[PDB]
Amino acid sequence: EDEFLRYLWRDYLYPKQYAWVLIAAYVAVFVVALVGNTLVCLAVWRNHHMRTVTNYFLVNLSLADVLATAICLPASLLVDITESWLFGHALCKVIPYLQAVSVSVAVLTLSFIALDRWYAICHPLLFKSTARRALGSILGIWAVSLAIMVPQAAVMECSSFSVCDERWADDLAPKIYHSCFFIVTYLAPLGLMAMAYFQIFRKLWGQMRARRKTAKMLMVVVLVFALCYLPISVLNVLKRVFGMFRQASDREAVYAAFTFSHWLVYANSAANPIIYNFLSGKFREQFKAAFSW
Ligand SMILES: CCCCCCCC/C=C\CCCCCCCC(=O)O[C@H](COC(=O)CCCCCCCCCCCCCCC)COP(=O)(O)OC[C@@H](O)CO
Ligand SMILES: CS(=O)(=O)c1cncc(N2C(=O)N(Cc3c(F)cc(F)cc3F)c3ncccc3S2(=O)=O)c1
Ligand SMILES: CCCCCCCCS[C@@H]1O[C@H](CO)[C@@H](O)[C@H](O)[C@H]1O
Ligand SMILES: CCCCCCCCS[C@@H]1O[C@H](CO)[C@@H](O)[C@H](O)[C@H]1O
Numbered sequence: 001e002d003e004f005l006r007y008l009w010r011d012y013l014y015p016k017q018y019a020w021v022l023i024a025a026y027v028a029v030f031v032v033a034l035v036g037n038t039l040v041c042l043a044v045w046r047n048h049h050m051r052t053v054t055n056y057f058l059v060n061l062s063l064a065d066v067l068a069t070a071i072c073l074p075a076s077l078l079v080d081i082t083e084s085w086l087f088g089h090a091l092c093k094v095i096p097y098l099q100a101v102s103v104s105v106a107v108l109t110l111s112f113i114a115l116d117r118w119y120a121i122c123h124p125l126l127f128k129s130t131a132r133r134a135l136g137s138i139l140g141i142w143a144v145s146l147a148i149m150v151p152q153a154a155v156m157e158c159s160s161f162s163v164c165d166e167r168w169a170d171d172l173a174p175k176i177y178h179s180c181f182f183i184v185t186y187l188a189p190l191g192l193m194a195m196a197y198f199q200i201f202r203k204l205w206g207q208m209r210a211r212r213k214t215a216k217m218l219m220v221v222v223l224v225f226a227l228c229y230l231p232i233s234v235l236n237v238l239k240r241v242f243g244m245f246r247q248a249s250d251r252e253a254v255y256a257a258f259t260f261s262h263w264l265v266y267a268n269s270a271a272n273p274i275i276y277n278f279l280s281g282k283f284r285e286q287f288k289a290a291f292s293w
């Protein structure tokens with residue numbers, strides 16, 4: 001009686017429960033991120049008081065988040081289910097490339113917000129910041145991101161069921177590449193950002209009341225980004241630099257860890273508009289307007 005209910009759980013009840021939760025979490029994030037991030041862009045298009053430097057950059061974060069949610073999220077959901085590539089050789093280069101480009105645009109956008117706030121508050125009359133110069137920064141963020149993520153597209157290969165993965169001729173190249181990737185897309189920008197906002201914090205809490213309502217929001221966006229991107233960033237360093245997760249002792253535990261980590265990246269795109277709702281009264285107003293209409 002008891003042994004049967006253990007194999008019923010193992011062989012049927014747990015796998016379906018797992019697959020249900022996995023698809024439900026991905027679909028919920030997909031819809032919430034698409035609706036939320038479109039309402040961010042519309043809010044600065046409809047409202048003209050909201051067209052500040054920070055908000056022009058926050059719209060660029062949403063464009064990057066939509067790129068990842070529309071194209072990369074479904075490819076990720078199907079790979080996390082089947083553990084195989086079903087989109088052919090071309091999209092095995094394009095989709096991982098667009099994921100990388102999306103991450104680069106996101107972390108560079110947040111960096112330039114911190115840099116703008118750091119000079120706006122801590123060093124006030126050194127550099128001038130306007131919406132016109134913000135659009136030129138935004139285009140430069142895309143140009144850099146599209147270029148620096150070409151080696152990523154270059155190593156992606158689809159090999160025969162098919163599997164999409166990075167192809168490396170030697171053991172040292174993936175170690176150097178993934179070390180640079182982690183430092184450049186995660187550790188150095190967020191460490192510098194942390195130090196910038198700590199100084200902004202000391203200035204505003206050591207025009208002001210408005211700057212405090214927006215700095216507060218900004219620090220939460222950077223903290224949630226750091227948290228959402230930490231599991232996958234660490235897991236890829238452990239795998240590519242420290243040669244971990246090669247033993248099939250618990251093939252499924254490794255899949256579960258990487259699966260949840262992949263979902264968390266996409267969960268961040270759903271999180272940002274929810275943050276602007278509870279920490280920005282101006283955004284909340286145009287969010288209440290969208291649900292009322
Ligand atoms: C502030 C600092 C951060 C920002 C720095 C800003 C600097 C911006 C500068 C220049 C922009 C222009 C770069 C444009 C990218 C250059 C284009 C490029 O990457 O060429 C590729 C080379 O592929 C390859 O083997 C690439 C394999 C990867 C080799 C890894 C070596 C480690 C070097 C460490 C790299 C850093 C990584 C950090 C990235 C975030 C593809 O070629 P190709 O189709 O002919 O071959 C295909 C062949 O591989 C298939 O057999
Ligand atoms: C869209 S996908 O599901 O088709 C797909 C298939 N295979 C691979 C990927 N990549 C991906 O998931 N990671 C894992 C990863 C992130 F996202 C984000 C990070 F901040 C750190 C990471 F460690 C990559 N990591 C390093 C370099 C390139 C990639 S990547 O090529 O962008 C995507
Ligand atoms: C003779 C060998 C043919 C093997 C077929 C490979 C199966 C991959 S189907 C894949 O589906 C995508 C849907 O997004 C399309 O965009 C792609 O073009 C297509 O490749
Ligand atoms: C890799 C680290 C990021 C590099 C940081 C450099 C800052 C770019 S400033 C930005 O550059 C645009 C280029 O198009 C100009 O048009 C804009 O006027 C200007 O504001």
Ligand SMILES: CCCCCCCCS[C@@H]1O[C@H](CO)[C@@H](O)[C@H](O)[C@H]1O
Nearest residue numbers: 154155156157167168169170173174
């Ligand atoms: C079917 C097409 C097969 C192409 C395979 C693409 C793999 C990228 S080769 C890449 O070349 C670099 C030279 O710069 C070395 O540093 C790296 O060690 C090596 O990984």
Ligand SMILES: CCCCCCCCS[C@@H]1O[C@H](CO)[C@@H](O)[C@H](O)[C@H]1O
Nearest residue numbers: 171172175176179240241242243244
């Ligand atoms: C964050 C690092 C602090 C821990 C100290 C160890 C530094 C060595 S790096 C790493 O050690 C691996 C061991 O498995 C090797 O296989 C890799 O070739 C090498 O790149």
